[PDB]
Amino acid sequence: RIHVLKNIHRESYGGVTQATFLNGQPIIVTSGGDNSLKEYVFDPSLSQGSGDVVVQPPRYLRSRGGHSQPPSYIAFADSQSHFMLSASKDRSLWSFSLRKDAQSQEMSQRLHKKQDGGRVGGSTIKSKFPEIVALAIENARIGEWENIITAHKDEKFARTWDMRNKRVGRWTFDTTDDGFVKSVAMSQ
Amino acid sequence: SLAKSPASTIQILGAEKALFRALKTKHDTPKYGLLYHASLVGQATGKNKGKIARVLAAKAAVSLRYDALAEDRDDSGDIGLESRAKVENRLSQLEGRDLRTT
Amino acid sequence: DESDINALTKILSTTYNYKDTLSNSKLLPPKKLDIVRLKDANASHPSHSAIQSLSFHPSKPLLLTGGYDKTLRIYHIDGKTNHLVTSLHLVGSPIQTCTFYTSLSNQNQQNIFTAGRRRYMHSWDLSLTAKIEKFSRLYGHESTQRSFENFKVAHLQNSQTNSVHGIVLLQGNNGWINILHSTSGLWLMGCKIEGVITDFCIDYQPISRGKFRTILIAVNAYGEVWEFDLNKNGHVIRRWKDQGGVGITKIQVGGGTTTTCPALQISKIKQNRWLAVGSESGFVNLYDRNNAMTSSTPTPVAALDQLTTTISNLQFSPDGQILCMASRAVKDALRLVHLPSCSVFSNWPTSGTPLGKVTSVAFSPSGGLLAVGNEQGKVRLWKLNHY
Amino acid sequence: DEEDIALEFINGEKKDKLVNMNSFTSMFDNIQNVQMDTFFDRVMKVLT
Amino acid sequence: SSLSDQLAQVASNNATVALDRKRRQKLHSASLIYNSKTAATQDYDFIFENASKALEELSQIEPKFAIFSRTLFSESSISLDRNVQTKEEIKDLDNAINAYLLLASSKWYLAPTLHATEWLVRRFQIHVKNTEMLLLSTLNYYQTPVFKRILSIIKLPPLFNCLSNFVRSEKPPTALTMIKLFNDMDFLKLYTSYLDQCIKHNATYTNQLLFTTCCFINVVAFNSNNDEKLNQLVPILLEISAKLLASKSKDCQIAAHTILVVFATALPLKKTIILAAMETILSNLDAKEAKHSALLTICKLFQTLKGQGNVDQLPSKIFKLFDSKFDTVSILTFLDKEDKPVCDKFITSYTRSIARYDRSKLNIILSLLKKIRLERYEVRLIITDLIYLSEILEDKSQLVELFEYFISINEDLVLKCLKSLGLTGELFEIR
Amino acid sequence: VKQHLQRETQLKQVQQRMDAQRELLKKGSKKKIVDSSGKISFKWKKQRKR
Amino acid sequence: GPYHIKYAKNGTHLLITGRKGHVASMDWRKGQLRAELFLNETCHSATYLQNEQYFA
Amino acid sequence: NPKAFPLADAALTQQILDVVQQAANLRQLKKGANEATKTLNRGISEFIIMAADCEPIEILLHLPLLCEDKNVPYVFVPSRVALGRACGVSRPVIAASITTNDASAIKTQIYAVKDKIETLL
Lengths: 188, 102, 387, 48, 431, 50, 56, 121
Hints:
The structure is cut from a larger assembly and holds eight protein chains of eight kinds.
Chain A: E1 16-21, E2 27-32, E3 36-41, E4 59-65, E5 71-76, E6 83-88, E7 93-97, E8 105-106, E9 132-137, E10 148-152, E11 157-162, E12 167-174
Antiparallel strand pairs in A: 1-2, 2-3, 3-4, 5-6, 6-7, 7-8, 9-10, 10-11, 11-12
Chain B: H1 7-11, H2 16-24, H3 39-43, H4 48-69, H5 78-95
Helix pairs in contact in B: 4-5
Chain E: H1 3-13, H2 21-28, H3 36-39, H4 44-61, H5 66-70, H6 87-103, H7 112-123, H8 131-137, H9 145-153, H10 175-182, H11 186-201, H12 206-222, H13 227-245, H14 250-266, H15 271-282, H16 289-303, H17 316-325, H18 328-335, H19 344-357, H20 363-371, H21 376-392, H22 397-408, H23 411-420, H24 424-430
Helix pairs in contact in E: 4-7, 10-12, 11-13, 12-14, 13-14, 14-16, 15-16, 15-17, 16-19, 18-20, 19-21, 21-23
């Protein structure tokens, strides 16, 4: 048994639904019911004499994907109707392209560093943010600082995001009255 | 008179002129002395022959004052032999390390 | 080539996991814990002082916290929402030790005994107004007991009837332990050790059907340990010496029924296997009483040295497979040492565990669940997924 | 009494030696021309 | 990619072809005996004739080199150039070189093999073409100047990357460097394939088995604190344990015993894996030192076994196989040893398998559990299945005297098991 | 002999102050303890060496 | 761009020119290049002169 | 061990190890046999504590021989492990010299313990 790629697709959406080798090629395309299509490639062997017995494990290559759950919120990122921000119940914020579907990219949730230098809390096993109730994007100062302000399900602070970097921001705005965030806005 | 001397003295015991010039001006003292010609310090190589000159002088102080101060001593080499096993596996564990990065 | 001593090759080509699965383990794996963090237990209602003592209920899902702000709080604990059951503020009486007592006869009393640096000790009778009584009479022995701080509650059998009753045990000045009734407050007996009494613990051993025997285990500061049989008159049966150990702060037993894992039914009383003597340098000797009740200079099965300042808590998990060393002197000084292997778990606590300055610790009797109270006034709560 | 049987099952467990990073580092010095059964009991002395 | 990268690829392909005099000198001065200034002036006839002398010496020591005198060391091979024939002739002579190297891996302490493989280094360029097999064959000799020499002249493969600070150095690689070399997973797959060819062609020698087992148990020791690396590592070293147990050498069998005992005490393996491991241990047990190691290995592998199911009766096939390899006198004697091994759970499983599968040899289980002491759950399960034996078959003196032993010690426990199932007056009326 | 004694006691005092400074700059937790006069001392935390 | 190829008159050296600017003189049979120069105007052709030592 | 003269009883060894612990907190002791003999040579030791627990005791019983030359008090305690705990290191300590001071906070405790030592000489 060469290798096992575990959790290559979600079991709840069907597992790996079709996997096929492109023939003559060391690349295999998988697709699952979680709205995802991946490719995995076999690199050539690392031993220069044996080869057939030292099989390097398959690594990841390109993939396309979308939301695995129906989206819960929708906004347009700019006045040109090129990108649109889209948040789903599977707790991901995607930025989908209306012009060319290769440009669709998941906004990353990799947090910044704390401003003073203290530790940030949270679980070690990183999971995605609670699913997005509302959002408000105003790209007047885009690239300059935080640009999207978003409000999640049953939590008392609103995160920010940067659409230029396509990532989370440094700030989570609290409500200061122990109430969940019911709306967000931002000025132009 | 050798047994009632500390192990640092037994380390530097041969190198008195280098020692006291390096103390009477504020310089770095020798590390070998008369104990440099032991076979274990011969087996060591680098700065760890200073290191095992130190551990060899410590175990030699142990064995030496055992020999001078024992009364039920047996002339069989037991304390010296277990001390030598301690010094040999210590020399092994600091010749096994290497300052290179692999 | 081919169509379809090879037993190992076949079992490897069929298996995909190679370790024991979930419940066919029944005893803890060493060196890697499995411990999730729950909601902080006193997060619902904050404490106004360092949390000096902490005890679970023997049966109910209740956690009693208490500290120098002279109030004691009971929390219904669960995973999500640890709420506050009730809360009693004794004015002018800061509390230092607070214990759920539950008798063996009917298991229906549910007293809380609490005490601090005072010449009295309160006893709240749990009734869900609040009827509390005050013990303030040493029946002729007030000179040798000037503060009710260090007490422990235990069970005692009459040994001519099969009638048990609770005793509280007060650590006094000279070498004295004053044992007195937990309902009437009558001074029953006293046990004097020779030196500076620093701590003590209670061991039980069964004898026959429905009869057990209570042993008080009291340690000098120097390291010599007395064991008193006290189901008879409080007479010494064994006197031994801790190997090493010069400033001795805390002794504990474990592996059977301690005062912190209490037995609900008299036939469920067990003999303790382990005995940990934790010291001022942070050294914890660990003795195995399945063989170290005979030697009279017994050697420890291991001397742990992992945390370097004064041992102020050491508690055994109810199964008796984890010991918890803890120090209130520096921050984050808590270790969970697995035993019989006598090896500290290396994956918890990490550098980011919010342990704080650990000034109390408690183990749940059923859930497999740590509560750790620090000097900021916070009980943090963890669940061990082996249980 | 299944809790008592489970407590005696976890009570009958004996202290063992665990493998460290450096429980076997000092064997290369004396794997020189010794026999393999002497190596086996030298390993078993480390494990016990 | 870039042009200098693609040209480095074509240089690495054309590494061995001498395309002018300076490359021929730099490429022919790489000797294993002489220094560069002598080695550059030597011929093929000179190095061939003294390598043929050394192969005659090596062949009268060990007579399996004569066919290498027929093909690899013949006089047609003076003019045989390596990089002028096709891939099929190349794979023919490269498995010829692999055959020579794993035959002469054992002989590396005596100078005829140095002067003989000198000709493979200089004619067939095996320091740069067949280099992985050369390193893997002489890996044992790493404190020695012959491994210093092959490291000085070698071109190091990418799997052997940590030896790159010990090439052209005056000090040998250390043991911690050897464990860092073995700690990789692809290197572990490579070395296990090398051992598979060794075990297949029957060339496993005891110095190699010692070195291999030492580095394997040090890999397991290094990875003893990360379970995912141990779990990546299990079907490699247990597969090589199966392939070492599936051979005839007592030395390689107890090498596999060492690997199995360290691996089972490093992580708790599955019960069925441990049982199939003891089946593979017993299925080829022929020696005596192998029997000593096999009994100690099966005892520790059953000791490191936790949970519900540690001390069942081991099944009928494996119990009668263990009987055919180890009878009663062997088990009783080994328990009577004053060094006191820890044989608790295995001996409990053994006596329970006797009570389910033999039903004649019960005096011996009385004697052996008189010898060694067990725990409360062990003797509780023993007396429960003895109670079931009394209720299935008629209760004679051997079962009676067993219950007299279980009355003479711990009579409260046999009362507790009878009260959990049965009665004491009813059992005394039974027997 | 009397001035040998004066030289020896002055050297003892200056080596004692030098040794206190060297002991002070090693490691561990410590606090500056001030007496009635102003003769400062450094009291080290009760913590054994790891 | 498209690469005009040129070999030396013994086959030891190769001289390639990109249409864009990339001229590389190299020993194509070892892995030794001895000139890689990017002359950012459109080159058309090249040749060796009497050697690998000069090229136009 | 028979040849470990004056050995302390429990009360004296408890107060000896108490003054060792507070001298270790005040950085006023030299722990180890070679450092003890160095303080013996330099004459800056108040008293020497040794352990009657080392398996060669002859690695110890040489500093008595230069204690009785400088009339500095010396004493034996039964446990090298407990002496190491008192000195506040992680290793067993075989001998320990409490060094001299005249502005020391624990000068009275040092003097009381050394008088209790030289009563039994």
